[PDB]
Nucleic acid binder design. Structure first.
Lengths: 229, 134, 123, 166, 591
RNA sequence: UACAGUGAAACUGCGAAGGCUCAUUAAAUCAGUUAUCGUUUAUUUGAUAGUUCCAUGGUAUAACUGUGGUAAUUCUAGAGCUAAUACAUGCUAAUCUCGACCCUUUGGAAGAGAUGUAUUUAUUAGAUCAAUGUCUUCGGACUCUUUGAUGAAAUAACUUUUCGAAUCGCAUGGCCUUGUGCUGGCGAUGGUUCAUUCAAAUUUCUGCCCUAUCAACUUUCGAUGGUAGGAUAGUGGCCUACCAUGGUUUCAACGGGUAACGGGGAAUAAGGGUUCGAUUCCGGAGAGGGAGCCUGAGAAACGG
């Protein structure tokens, strides 16, 4: 019943928490109860995890946002004050939720995949991300599946990382939740098995879907750091 | 056709080809020692159990390490225990003599047909078998 | 081209570029046709996914019944069974399709009970 | 109407043995409340939360647009002469969408006389009806979903377009 | 209650004229002040009193927009609105600078004048004001400081009211009273006068015929000031001519031209200004350009000089006679200016029009022989006619060919100005050869042969209309000269023009081999025709783009070979567009 | 001596927010998946409100009192007051640009255009030029070359038309208009619209029985399609007029089963139990039985 992404061990209980409404999806989010409680273990149970969320130490997306089933999904920059626990959370190679530690420099920003640019009302330029960052007045060349950079103090798009040929990609979807390397090919169809394909250590080639993909940076220079091992 | 996510297609099952015969040979010919216990602390109900099996002591190590790793005593969930614990102690007291289980020699499971005789690297060409030998 | 009542008029002649690999004919851009449900102008919007295949029957007006055979390496009987499919499709005045006549179409906006597709390109 | 579903009526293959389901809420096949002539009376039906919807029943004050200048002015309603989505519709003279109804057009007349000065560029097939007063006009807005009587006057091509038919 | 007020003004028209006038007289008498202000000026008012006349003007404006048919016009209401304007002027002018109530009263003054001028717009030839003297006096006292104050691209209170007074015939009593056209021509001839100056000149043009037709000598002096204003603001109609309406300038120049023609400087400026529509841009309308040319000739027949106006009209004749559009209409205007420039060269232009343009017979075929036997030395219109017959024309094709050959002989007879004219002949011959011409491109090749009179022998070998052995001999002769940017581009474009991918004969692959071999022989020249090879290979890329993918693909594959040979002989360059071309081919590869 | 702590009965905010029995539904149930610019969406989350002519708005009614009826219910009849974040009427600074004129740096005065939102009707804004170069006349006409860009909701009206703060807190704090004269720094809830989340319904595709003694089916709840009307959250023959004779199938239509108390990966796997062995749902209903209405972001309500 409990999803694979949170690394919920089967030794949990009986009932798994359904994460509520928020910025992110149902399948692409782990709430703060399963984050703090049994992933990096700053609380032991529901009582004291509600106690620390009422003590209000957390600054996910730079705000407190006190709720257990608050769906803090992909790359919501978690920030906890006591000994500066700064965590940007990504996917690992098997679909789970990795939590890469950052510092205050990397915690002063994040990115977002654009989902549509519309001309709704009063002629205002328009961009929404996965976390609903309705940010005002970009360059008019915000294309489909492009990437904006969020200031995390304001909302303003400070940098703009394009979805095009020769940029380091991310994938959230397919049989391939979360791989990196993006250079064998760009095979663009018109709606199905349409993607930029990804390499490996032996430089293999993989197939994914287009809106199940965004850009993280450039091949050889991402400033959004990645862990190792 | 199209791509579907599947945890059962990249999940650590890893129990379809573990056989106690093979692991017993690997433990014999490993040349790394094996962390046995002090010799009294392994028998259980003052003897009324077995000693205890190797699967039992690894599972018990997992339960107490999960215990000391996230601070939680388990329960007496009755459907689960009324199946698994009574069936566990009953197969233990039928098959496990002296702390060593002997049910692996009285149970049909083909050793070669899951554990040896590799499947992907089956070498279905003579060129492939010559290259992989040399 | 005014047979039926109720002020056949356009909807706001007016034209649009469907695009996405589907070229619209200039006669449909600025002609006399009402252009009510072509993917090029119409009132519909194209979306979804695309299909390809020949046709069998174009007897009624604004019906194109498209045949779709697809290949699949079946390992059950270790052989292949020949695929066949059918679905009606609305017209668009580009090339008048008889028996044969491969067409690609795209998913859009239900018109009658069994059609979600409208012709964009013929060969 | 009763429902809106492909279960109780057959598909293209003509399958049998239905016994499908008991009908649910979202197939609320409402009563058609056909608008007629009277004094303005509307029903505010309730659906999908705070979704009010005006079903017009006796609205008279027609908001019709001079189409060649797009001036939506406010007149009366006399009667239909053509709507063969049902051959009963012209006989019982109801009021719905895409209906051409006759209108005493003195507000349009005085807008012509207030921007122009002269009384009667334009067709004589509408000049005889400017001399008359009674014009032909097609209602485009939905009395059953929008709850008004909004339409466009007929001038020239559309006038003769309905006139050659009837 | 605002939407209720819209409903009130909407349904205030179902009453009669007597009821409307009684309601208007009741609305006027709430804020009339007519014992105190209907003689000279307003004696006293407050913020509350200045708001009552402001709302009187507000209801007056809404009543004007509703009943713009009569508006219930009355002398009491006119005197009351004049009292309101005078009261707002007095309060706003002598009230001290606090700017709050003064700004409200300055907004009420513009909106009150808008309530007044709407009667002049909607009740124009219905009111027929005989009592205009007091209101015109207060109007001059209001807008005496409106020289350039109401002058901009959107200031339209005094502009609109003066247009209402000016664009009628009998409304100009207040124009001939003291001054209207003074302010209008000041706003027109301002130094940076904005895009409403065209409408100011439009109001002056609409008032000039009124000042002509009126029986007053004051209106005659106003028409004298109209001619003086048109001659004084001639650069306003050039600096505000960034919009499409040059026909309005042509129709104002013709009306003033049928009014008067004054001096040689007026003729010089008017010739140069109607000539600006032939010597500035090409985006004028058909009747606009023909009317401007006929009016330039109608002023040149009026007061033109002998050298400079002849030069302007001769440049116009040389441009328009080789243009020759509008089914001999612009050519008829060019012939009119040709006879009307009034010189010996103008007489030659008139004769070269007269013998050649006699209405779609063998008249041009007789005039070609007449000019070949009696070619003059002015030759502007003659070379115009000898290039226009050299163009894609029906008759006198070989006659224009013989005229061009005798023209090259005349170039060798004069030999440097007739070799400077050959530069224009070359830059027009390339423009004719790079087209769909058949007889004209062959006559341009005959002009190349006559100018080049081994090269001319290979030209006589190629010009045989066989083009299999002849095109093979063209490839072999180009290879003989192989074993010149525009000249090699001319020969290659002539090859591509005679073999322009037209699928009605074979050996087009060997013809493409001939064109690409001539391109490669020019491409061996790495110092001079490098831009020629660059433009040719870019044109092969553009032809590989523009709907032809079977000929220009092999053409680009042959174009790359001289590049690879020159790079092999190199064993720096502009590889940025080369990587762009590799990326463009990679874009075409998966597509 | 207009409110003061416990405090028997009421409304409010919320609660019960998910469970029995019977006949046996074959990719129509169900799952994965595309879309919804075809659409309803409380909640979560992100943004986002300028049309004022000669010191704060009226009664109707509970609780409360009082007289009574009935064998009698959270059954009732008169009479009296009393106040509401209850009905429902009405009080609200001058601020945005082009900048005739400049006096040179502290640079802005004259004139003009101004200023929301929602419901449904129509025209519409949504082919140009700059260089690194063809000619160089060491000057320019320049987009066919080499590339580069705005780019193939403003107006004329309807409407029993919504609001521009009667919420609370942290803060005495500034300026002399000689007094709450101007208060003024700050945060949450307000509130229109849009987006997002979640959810709902429709939609293309994908998924183990035998099947021809089931070979023809489908117009005998319209069969297949157009055009229009209705109503729907909307598209939609989902119902209605007129019109065409359609549409599928031997490449298996339609039609007939059990071990469909068993099955469909629906899924925990258990380190040897080799189909026993964990879980989602058998199908759809019903609250005595059909029939008709209403409620709500969601209901044809387990509790109207």
């Amino acid at each position: 019943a409990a999803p694979h992404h949170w690394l919920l061990d089967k030794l949990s209980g009986c009932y798994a928490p359904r994460p509520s409404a928020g910025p992110h999806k149902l399948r692409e989010s782990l709430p703060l109860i399963v984050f703090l409680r049994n992933r990096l273990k700053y609380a032991l149970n529901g009582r004291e995890v509600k106690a620390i969320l009422m003590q209000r130490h957390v600054k996910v997306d730079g705000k407190v946002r006190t709720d257990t089933t608050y769906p803090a999904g992909f790359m919501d920059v978690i920030t906890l004050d006591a000994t500066n626990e700064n965590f940007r959370l990504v996917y690992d190679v098997k679909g789970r939720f990795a939590v890469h530690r950052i510092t205050d420099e990397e915690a002063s920003y994040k990115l977002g995949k654009v989902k549509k640019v519309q001309l709704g009302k009063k002629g205002v330029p328009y961009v929404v991300t996965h976390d609903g960052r309705t940010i005002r007045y970009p360059d008019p060349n915000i294309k489909v599946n492009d990437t904006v950079k969020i200031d995390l103090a304001s909302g303003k798009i400070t940098d703009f990382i394009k979805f095009d040929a020769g940029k380091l990609v991310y994938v959230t979807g397919g049989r391939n939740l979360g791989r990196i390397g993006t250079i064998v090919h760009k095979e663009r169809h018109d709606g199905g098995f349409d993607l930029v394909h990804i390499k490996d250590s032996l430089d293999n080639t993989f197939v994914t879907r287009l809106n199940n993909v965004f850009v993280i940076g450039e091949q050889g220079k991402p400033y959004i750091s990645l862990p190792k091992g | 056709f199209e791509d579907r996510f599947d945890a059962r297609e990249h999940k650590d099952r890893s129990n379809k080809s573990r056989m106690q015969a093979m692991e017993e040979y690997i433990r014999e010919s490993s040349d790394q020692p094996d962390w046995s216990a002090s010799i009294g602390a392994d028998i259980v109900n003052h003897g009324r159990g077995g000693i205890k099996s190797l699967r039992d002591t690894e599972k018990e190590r997992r339960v107490t390490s999960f215990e000391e790793d996230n601070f939680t005593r388990l329960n007496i969930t009755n459907k689960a225990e009324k199946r698994k614990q009574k069936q566990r102690e009953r197969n233990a007291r039928m098959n496990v003599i002296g702390g060593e289980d002997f049910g692996i020699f009285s149970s049909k499971r083909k050793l070669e047909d899951s554990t040896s005789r590799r499947g992907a690297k089956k070498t279905r060409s003579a060129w492939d078998r010559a290259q992989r030998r040399l | 081209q005014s047979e039926r009542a109720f002020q056949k008029q356009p909807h706001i002649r007016w034209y649009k570029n469907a695009g996405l690999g589907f070229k619209t004919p200039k006669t449909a851009i600025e002609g006399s046709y009402i252009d009510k449900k072509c993917p090029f102008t119409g009132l519909v919007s194209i979306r979804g996914k695309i299909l390809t295949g020949t046709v069998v029957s174009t007897k009624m007006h604004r019906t194109i019944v498209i045949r779709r055979a697809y290949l699949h390496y079946i390992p059950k009987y270790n052989r292949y069974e020949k695929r066949h499919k059918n679905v009606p499709v609305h017209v668009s005045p580009a090339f008048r399709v008889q028996v044969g006549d491969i067409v690609t179409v795209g998913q859009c906006r239900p018109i009658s009970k069994t059609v979600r597709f409208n012709v964009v390109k013929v060969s | 109407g009763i429902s809106r579903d492909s279960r109780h009526k057959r598909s293209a293959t003509g399958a049998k043995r239905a016994q499908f389901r008991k009908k649910r809420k979202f197939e609320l096949g409402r009563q058609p409340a056909n608008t007629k002539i009277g004094a303005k009376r509307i029903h505010s039906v309730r659906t999908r939360g705070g979704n009010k919807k005006y079903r017009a029943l006796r609205i008279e004050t027609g908001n019709f647009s001079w189409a060649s200048e797009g001036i939506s002015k406010k007149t009366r309603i006399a009667g239909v002469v053509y709507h063969p989505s049902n051959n009963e519709l012209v006989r019982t003279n109801t009021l719905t969408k895409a209906a051409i109804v006759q209108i005493d057009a003195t507000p349009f007349r005085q807008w012509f006389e207030a921007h122009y000065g002269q009384t009667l560029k334009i067709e004589s097939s509408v000049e005889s009806q400017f001399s008359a007063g009674r014009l032909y006009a097609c209602i485009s807005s939905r009395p059953g979903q929008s709850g008004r009587c909004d339409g466009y006057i007929l001038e020239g091509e559309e006038l003769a377009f309905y006139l050659r038919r009837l | 209650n605002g939407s209720q007020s819209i409903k009130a003004e909407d349904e205030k028209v179902v009453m009669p004229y007597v009821l409307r006038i009684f309601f208007g007289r009741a609305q006027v008498p709430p804020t009339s002040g007519q014992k105190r202000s209907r003689k000279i000026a307003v004696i006293s008012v407050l913020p509350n009193f200045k708001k009552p006349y402001i709302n009187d003007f507000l209801s007056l404006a809404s009543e004007r927009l509703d009943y713009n048919y009569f508006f219930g016009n009355s002398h009491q209401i006119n005197s009351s609105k004049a009292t309101l304007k005078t009261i707002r002027r007095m309060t706003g002018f002598v009230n001290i600078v606090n700017s709050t109530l003064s700004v409200l009263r300055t907004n009420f003054p513009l909106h009150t004048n808008s309530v007044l001028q709407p009667l002049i717009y909607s009740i124009a030839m219905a009111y027929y004001v005989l009592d205009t003297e007091s209101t015109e006096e207060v109007h001059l006292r209001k807008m005496a400081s409106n020289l350039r104050q109401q002058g901009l691209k959107c200031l339209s209170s005094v502009f609109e009211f003066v247009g209402n007074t000016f664009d009628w015939s009998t409304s100009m009593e207040d124009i001939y009273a003291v001054v209207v056209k003074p302010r209008i021509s000041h706003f027109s001839d301002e130094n940076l006068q904005q895009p409403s100056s065209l409408l100011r000149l439009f109001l002056y043009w609409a008032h000039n015929p009124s000042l002509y037709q009126f029986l007053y000598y004051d209106e005659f002096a106003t028409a004298t000031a109209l001619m003086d204003t048109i001659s004084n603001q001639h650069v306003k109609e050039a600096v505000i001519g960034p919009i499409i309406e040059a026909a309005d300038s042509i129709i104002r120049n013709p009306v003033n031209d049928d009014h008067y023609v004054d001096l040689v400087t007026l003729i010089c400026t008017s010739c140069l200004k109607i000539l600006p529509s032939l010597y500035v841009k090409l985006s004028d309308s058909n009747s606009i350009s023909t009317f401007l040319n006929l009016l330039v000739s109608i002023t040149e027949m009026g007061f033109i000089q002998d050298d400079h106006v002849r030069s302007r009209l001769i440049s116009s004749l040389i441009s328009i006679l080789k243009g020759k559009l509008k089914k001999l209409q612009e050519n008829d205007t060019q012939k009119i200016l040709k006879i009307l420039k009034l010189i010996v060269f103008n007489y030659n232009c008139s004769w070269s029009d007269i013998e050649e343009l006699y209405t779609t017979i063998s008249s041009l075929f007789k005039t070609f022989d007449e000019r070949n036997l009696r070619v003059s030395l002015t030759e502007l219109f003659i070379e115009l006619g000898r290039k226009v017959p050299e163009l894609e024309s029906i008759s006198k094709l070989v006659a224009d060919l013989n005229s061009y050959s005798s023209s090259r002989m005349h170039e060798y007879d004069f030999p440097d100005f007739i070799n400077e004219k050959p530069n224009l002949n070359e830059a027009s011959k390339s423009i004719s050869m790079l087209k769909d011409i058949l007889l004209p491109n062959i006559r341009i090749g005959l002009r190349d042969s006559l100018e080049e009179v081994v090269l001319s022998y290979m030209v006589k070998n190629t010009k045989y209309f066989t083009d299999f052995e002849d095109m093979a001999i063209l490839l072999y002769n180009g290879d003989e000269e192989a074993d010149r940017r525009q000249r090699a581009i001319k020969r290659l474009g002539e090859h591509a023009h005679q073999l322009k991918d037209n699928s009605i004969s074979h050996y087009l692959i060997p013809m493409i081999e001939h064109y690409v071999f001539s391109d490669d022989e020019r491409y061996r020249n790495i110092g001079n025709e490098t831009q020629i090879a660059i433009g040719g290979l870019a044109q092969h890329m553009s032809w590989n783009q523009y709907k032809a993918l079977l000929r220009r693909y092999i053409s680009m594959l042959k174009t790359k070979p001289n590049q690879m040979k020159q790079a092999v002989q190199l064993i720096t360059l502009r590889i940025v567009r080369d990587g762009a071309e590799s990326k463009l081919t990679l874009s075409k590869f998966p597509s």
